[PDB]
Amino acid sequence: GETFEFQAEITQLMSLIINTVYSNKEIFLRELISNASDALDKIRYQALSDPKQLETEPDLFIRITPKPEEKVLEIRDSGIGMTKAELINNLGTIAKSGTKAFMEALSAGADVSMIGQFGVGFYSLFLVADRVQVISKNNEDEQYIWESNAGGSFTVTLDEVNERIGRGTVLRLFLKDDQLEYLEEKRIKEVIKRHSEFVAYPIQLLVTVQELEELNKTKPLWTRNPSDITQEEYNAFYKSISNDWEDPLYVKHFSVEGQLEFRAILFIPKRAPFNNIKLYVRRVFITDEAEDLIPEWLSFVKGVVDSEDLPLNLSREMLQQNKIMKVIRKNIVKKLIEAFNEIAEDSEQFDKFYSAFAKNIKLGVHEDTQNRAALAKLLRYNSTKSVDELTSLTDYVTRMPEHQKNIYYITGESLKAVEKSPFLDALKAKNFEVLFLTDPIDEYAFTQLKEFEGKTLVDITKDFELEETDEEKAEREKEIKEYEPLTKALKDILGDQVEKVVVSYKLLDAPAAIRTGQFGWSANMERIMKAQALRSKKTFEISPKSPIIKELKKRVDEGGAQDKTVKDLTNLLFETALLTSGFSLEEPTSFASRINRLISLGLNID
Amino acid sequence: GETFEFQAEITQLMSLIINTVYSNKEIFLRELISNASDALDKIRYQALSDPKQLETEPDLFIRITPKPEEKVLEIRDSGIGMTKAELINNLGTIAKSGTKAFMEALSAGADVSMIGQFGVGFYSLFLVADRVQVISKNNEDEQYIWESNAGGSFTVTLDEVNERIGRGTVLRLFLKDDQLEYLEEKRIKEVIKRHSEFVAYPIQLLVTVQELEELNKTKPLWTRNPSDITQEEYNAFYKSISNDWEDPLYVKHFSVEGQLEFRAILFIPKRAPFNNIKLYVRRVFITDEAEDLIPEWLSFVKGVVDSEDLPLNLSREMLQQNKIMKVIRKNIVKKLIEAFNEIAEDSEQFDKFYSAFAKNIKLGVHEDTQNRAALAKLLRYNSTKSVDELTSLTDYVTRMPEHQKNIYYITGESLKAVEKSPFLDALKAKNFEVLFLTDPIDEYAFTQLKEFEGKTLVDITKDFELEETDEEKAEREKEIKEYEPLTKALKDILGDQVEKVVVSYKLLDAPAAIRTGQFGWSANMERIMKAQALRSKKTFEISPKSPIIKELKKRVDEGGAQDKTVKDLTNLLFETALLTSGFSLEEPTSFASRINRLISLGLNID
Ligand SMILES: Nc1ncnc2c1ncn2[C@@H]1O[C@H](COP(=O)(O)OP(=O)(O)NP(=O)(O)O)[C@@H](O)[C@H]1O
Ligand SMILES: Nc1ncnc2c1ncn2[C@@H]1O[C@H](COP(=O)(O)OP(=O)(O)NP(=O)(O)O)[C@@H](O)[C@H]1O
Ligand SMILES: [Mg+2]
Ligand SMILES: [Mg+2]
């Protein structure tokens, strides 16, 4: 049948590209600098084969001159420029990107990496300007003026009233009556620092005597190998990408080659606030709101990532959904894990790294599952054998005897409450080391690990059993069977406050304590859960080697299982053991009342 | 001078709209259903003036008949259809939207609201298909076939081998090999539920026996009159917009007819979800990730918002930054405040609502400032006179005596620990009501309020002054200096644990108590801060009329300022006051050992 070619309504496509493509109206400056950088890259590539191309204009720069008295923001560069034909075919045709044609026409293997590849970015200037007066000048042509008012047609006339420029393009922007904000120095500097910070060419800005100030003093470091970059340059780079005042603690500069090519310079700060990783394609900032490239627990680091094969959208403000995001996320996680392992080789630097980002590492163990074993070796806690220095789990399993098959730890509110806990005497009598956990997020990660190099993590606050000789077990069972009336009477006294009352030999000096029941929340977990602003079973055991329990035993033998004088004593002892174990004290008024009664008894007053 | 018209490269403009824009590949179905809905709206408006237009096909529907045998996802509708000239200019031209041409040619007082306003949405089908065969049929022309290969030209041939449809368009989408996922019923139903759920015209889908199933069974309610909607319809609408299984508690259906006309049906769930509010433009879901649309503390509210004059971008997945979302946020906040006030008029309804979203309201008092006084009326807490039922702040200040100027409250870990706290007897003697704060987020709101109807919020756990008579102030000053040597000796024993020790008359039944101070954190605030997963000063007081303090007074009169038996009592009583006030002990081992010493002394243990 009949065949027709596709057409495009210019009077509607122009408004479609200008108004309904870009969300913000400040990226017009970023696109103009990107076009100027592409022109300078073209004239530089032409200068490598012919040095006479820079005789007219030797300096390569981009000059921006705001004029509030004339309502014009001029954009002047010293690039290759546009001839009479380029002002019609390249600049006058929508979706025509001559920068793409220049990139595909050069010989394979060039070092240049230009930015423009769509062909409609130049029309973004009309979002803040009504009429434009772009002036071009090429070495192989005269000086012309490209005038437009975002209408249906454009006018190109020979320049005979303006100054004779050497080489480059002068983009005269007549701003609208409601877009005068872009004539201020602070607004221009903010747009540059946000979108046009790491351009390879100097961005000169005319500020008020008139002077020129460069807005891109900091050069990108991802274009150089990590072998010839000093630490001060890394500190300046970190202070430039972020508003932080302190130098980065550690820098990780890697480069992945092969099917995916991308470079990233990830920095580790010196403090924690309790996204951050910027994305750069063709030396231009695209977006920083992609949460899928970096995990939430790992979002404490700062830095930028440079790439060239990312499928950028038309607006150049973000990227499409692709499978490369998972690849770059895995690479960043692996490189940061390697960086953490390198920091672990040092003692002074890793101390600051752990004291500043312990929560992030412990979160990495809690949520993440693939790198859980790698992050478990970075945990540092105190123990009975290490009171001052922090000891890892790798050094913990080395000091474990041949008969110990489990890793013992303990949680609590503070370090002073767990260092003198009544659950440590039994483990120290057997020369068993017990770790110390003082942060509320420690148990959230220890409940996910449940194993380290084959050693099961056992919490001493919960119920647990220890191996012993058959003779000791036979003697302990014959002692437990005779304390049975005491535990039975004490259970009836406590009522439903505890699950059961059994004799425990894991207490030497403490008279009694309350443990957990191997399941549910522990003594510290329920305290953390009942204290969150945005958001189990207990067992009472006594020690048969304490004089207090020995005196309580002879009370039920004479018929004192239901006396009124003993009830006050056993209830107060239960609430005291409840406090020393880490549980929540319900109704402290009766506790204080009984305490005051003993005070009166000790002060000889009734 | 030389004037030239703007041009557009077809081979590049097409590629611009095939990879850059429409970052998601599943929205091709949404756009095609929107085009079918526009065609049906056209034929429905044409039927209002000529009923004979629907004689060829009376039914109005969109049929989705997948065919995995030949890898085609054909979409058939019964809209107005396109003629021979419409398949060239309306469909074959980029950025040409005949739907906009039909909208601008509408009569005065039209009611139809069509979706098509750009003209590039039809070309989104090439994201998953390599070639299309659009079969159109209009009442004023013959049945033609519009074929394309996503290249630079298209072919239009007269239909001779396909079905002789009555009226509408048939779009044969030959899906690519890597995009065969859209041939299953699950993917089609998910895309329809995500974007094309609330289309006014029925969407038919062939599920393979060949049977048809309507996907858009839930009709929208924002177009109908809110006063005519029943509760079951609101429940069914809530079950469709959200995956929740519980019925909505309260529904707020309002419509603002100001400078920006928009409809919104906000629902109140029954459980806290710890975005949620979806945005619709002309019965089309665009996005649900709007930040400025709803505050953070208000994210628990579910519902949808329908607007018409919104700056839709090219991809129709976000709004442009035109500073128009602030008025929508303000209207939503105001309407939900009115909704909460209406819920407060009912007893059982507000009891069910406050029991599920108390933290959300308290967080709203914490961060929000413009509606802080409005949200303060919804705060419900217990008190000494309201131990059973909840009481607001208005009912609290109405029962305040004429000589009370401050609102007294108390915070603690639980309600049983604050109902008998020794800080209540001082206010109970003056017949002053004291609120009970049992949640960790209550102080974060009470610190931001600081006042309610001129009454200053004063925490009784902190240092505060009570009004007294000169006859009582005289005897208080006479007895304060009498106890001064006891306080000096007690401070010398306590050391740096407390700042100062003052004889406070705000204690009647307790021998002593400890407070934080006048400024800074409270007793429970520092405990919550030290118990958070992502994350002081003390003033000691005594009661001069207690037998314990009266006996301790005579101890220092005989030279007992530095005895060995008084320091044990001093430390023990200090930790007891530290317990009853809501703090945490420095070490429970020392407290447990001291209590065990009392037990040995009481049990005559030598
Ligand atoms: N300042 C300039 N100096 C010289 N040539 C320029 C300048 N600005 C634009 N051009 C030319 O005009 C063409 C049109 O560019 P433009 O419409 O901005 O889109 P693009 O830069 O080519 N691709 P993109 O940046 O992704 O939108 C460029 O390819 C250059 O050849
Ligand atoms: N199924 C259809 N039946 C009849 N006419 C149709 C159909 N699909 C598209 N058209 C016509 O083709 C035109 C092109 O529409 P399209 O390219 O999809 O963008 P649009 O819908 O007009 N505007 P937008 O939805 O914002 O992209 C429409 O305006 C209709 O006039
Ligand atoms: Mg450009
Ligand atoms: Mg469309």
Side-chain angles (χ1 to χ4, degrees), chain A residues 31 35 116 121-122:
Chain A
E31 190 61 41
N35 300 336
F122 173 79

Side-chain angles (χ1 to χ4, degrees), chain A residues 407-447:
Chain A
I407 291 181
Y408 307 97
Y409 62 93
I410 178 177
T411 43
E413 180 258 345
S414 158
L415 183 60
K416 299 186 301 179
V418 300
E419 64 178 353
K420 292 298 180 299
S421 180
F423 300 152
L424 290 187
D425 51 352
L427 275 298
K428 287 310 290 202
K430 307 179 62 59
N431 282 287
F432 285 167
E433 193 180 4
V434 173
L435 296 168
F436 291 155
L437 302 183
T438 66
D439 301 331
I441 207 63
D442 294 311
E443 186 145 310
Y444 288 90
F446 270 73
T447 44

Side-chain angles (χ1 to χ4, degrees), chain A residues 22 30-32 34-40 42 75-77 79-82 86 90-102 115-124 134 136 168-171 313-314 316:
Chain A
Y22 318 108
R30 173 256 292 173
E31 190 61 41
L32 291 189
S34 312
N35 300 336
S37 175
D38 292 335
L40 278 175
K42 290 175 184 178
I75 303 294
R76 179 181 181 180
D77 69 325
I80 179 175
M82 290 173 289
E86 294 184 15
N90 217 334
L91 202 66
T93 299
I94 315 177
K96 176 59 181 178
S97 182
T99 310
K100 179 182 177 181
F102 201 94
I115 300 166
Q117 66 180 357
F118 292 152
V120 307
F122 173 79
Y123 310 99
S124 158
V134 170
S136 159
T169 49
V170 193
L171 287 90
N313 56 357
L314 175 57
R316 289 185 175 271

Side-chain angles (χ1 to χ4, degrees), chain A residues 154-385:
Chain A
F154 53 92
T155 50
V156 178
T157 175
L158 184 66
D159 202 340
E160 292 292 326
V161 197
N162 292 270
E163 58 179 355
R164 304 293 96 181
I165 55 179
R167 186 194 69 253
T169 49
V170 193
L171 287 90
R172 163 141 61 250
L173 301 174
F174 293 95
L175 299 191
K176 303 179 181 299
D177 56 15
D178 54 87
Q179 301 289 338
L180 190 147
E181 189 180 3
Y182 295 93
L183 288 176
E184 194 67 29
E185 167 188 356
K186 271 306 293 162
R187 179 57 177 180
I188 290 296
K189 282 185 172 178
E190 280 166 299
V191 171
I192 290 298
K193 204 188 184 60
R194 178 62 182 182
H195 297 280
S196 198
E197 177 60 59
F198 290 114
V199 184
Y201 300 96
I203 307 312
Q204 300 178 356
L205 165 63
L206 188 64
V207 299
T208 316
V209 53
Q210 303 290 336
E211 50 184 349
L212 292 171
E213 178 183 359
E214 317 168 29
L215 322 170
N216 56 324
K217 291 286 192 58
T218 299
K219 296 303 178 182
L221 293 186
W222 61 78
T223 42
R224 302 159 54 186
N225 301 271
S227 63
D228 59 355
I229 306 147
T230 189
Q231 315 273 18
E232 195 69 27
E233 287 180 355
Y234 283 129
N235 302 331
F237 193 89
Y238 175 75
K239 289 181 297 180
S240 315
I241 50 184
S242 87
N243 53 277
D244 206 318
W245 185 82
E246 307 179 16
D247 300 2
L249 182 60
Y250 190 81
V251 53
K252 168 57 68 179
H253 190 181
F254 62 95
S255 315
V256 183
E257 185 65 27
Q259 41 79 21
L260 168 64
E261 58 155 20
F262 75 100
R263 304 180 180 180
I265 315 180
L266 306 178
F267 297 89
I268 294 91
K270 289 186 175 180
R271 60 101 174 160
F274 290 155
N275 51 65
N276 275 25
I277 299 295
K278 276 82 177 175
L279 287 178
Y280 280 80
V281 175
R282 310 295 187 173
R283 315 303 102 87
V284 179
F285 169 76
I286 44 172
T287 187
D288 51 350
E289 303 176 358
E291 68 268 37
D292 59 356
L293 67 96
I294 176 169
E296 295 293 328
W297 58 268
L298 204 41
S299 198
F300 70 99
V301 291
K302 204 90 80 187
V304 302
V305 192
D306 184 286
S307 309
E308 298 185 25
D309 282 8
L310 297 183
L312 304 176
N313 56 357
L314 175 57
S315 84
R316 289 185 175 271
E317 318 204 349
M318 58 173 268
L319 74 163
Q320 316 170 2
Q321 301 105 290
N322 53 1
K323 216 62 80 184
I324 298 89
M325 261 301 183
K326 297 321 176 271
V327 193
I328 186 179
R329 172 197 188 99
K330 174 192 65 63
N331 285 271
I332 284 177
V333 164
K334 178 66 170 61
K335 286 301 179 299
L336 279 181
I337 285 300
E338 186 60 38
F340 297 158
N341 293 330
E342 290 178 289
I343 296 175
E345 288 173 303
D346 196 74
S347 44
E348 186 68 28
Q349 188 178 7
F350 191 74
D351 172 70
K352 301 183 184 62
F353 170 74
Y354 195 87
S355 52
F357 309 110
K359 301 291 184 177
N360 301 88
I361 294 304
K362 291 160 197 183
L363 280 172
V365 194
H366 173 76
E367 282 85 3
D368 189 76
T369 319
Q370 176 184 0
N371 300 271
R372 185 172 300 176
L375 282 162
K377 306 178 183 301
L378 306 169
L379 300 177
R380 299 296 194 276
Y381 308 112
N382 293 116
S383 84
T384 58
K385 302 179 181 179

Side-chain angles (χ1 to χ4, degrees), chain B residues 31 35 39 42 82 90 97-99 116-119 121-122 169 316:
Chain B
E31 216 58 43
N35 300 336
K42 291 176 183 179
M82 291 169 288
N90 216 330
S97 182
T99 310
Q117 67 180 357
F118 293 153
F122 164 77
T169 49
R316 288 177 170 264

Side-chain angles (χ1 to χ4, degrees), chain B residues 29-48 54 57-64 75-81 99 102-103 106 111-116 167 192-193 195-205 213-220 222-223 282-284:
Chain B
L29 180 51
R30 169 254 289 181
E31 216 58 43
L32 287 184
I33 303 305
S34 312
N35 300 336
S37 174
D38 288 310
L40 277 171
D41 284 323
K42 291 176 183 179
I43 203 57
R44 185 177 55 89
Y45 182 81
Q46 278 192 344
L48 291 181
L54 258 59
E57 185 49 51
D59 198 8
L60 309 184
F61 64 97
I62 298 89
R63 189 169 302 177
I64 309 301
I75 295 181
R76 173 189 178 184
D77 70 323
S78 63
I80 177 175
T99 310
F102 206 98
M103 283 289 304
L106 275 173
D111 202 351
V112 298
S113 75
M114 297 169 189
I115 316 161
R167 188 190 72 257
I192 290 300
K193 178 73 176 183
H195 306 278
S196 198
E197 184 187 3
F198 295 108
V199 177
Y201 299 95
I203 310 303
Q204 298 181 0
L205 170 64
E213 175 185 0
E214 186 176 358
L215 304 176
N216 52 332
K217 290 184 175 299
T218 300
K219 258 57 184 178
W222 55 72
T223 42
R282 305 165 179 268
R283 307 160 300 184
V284 192

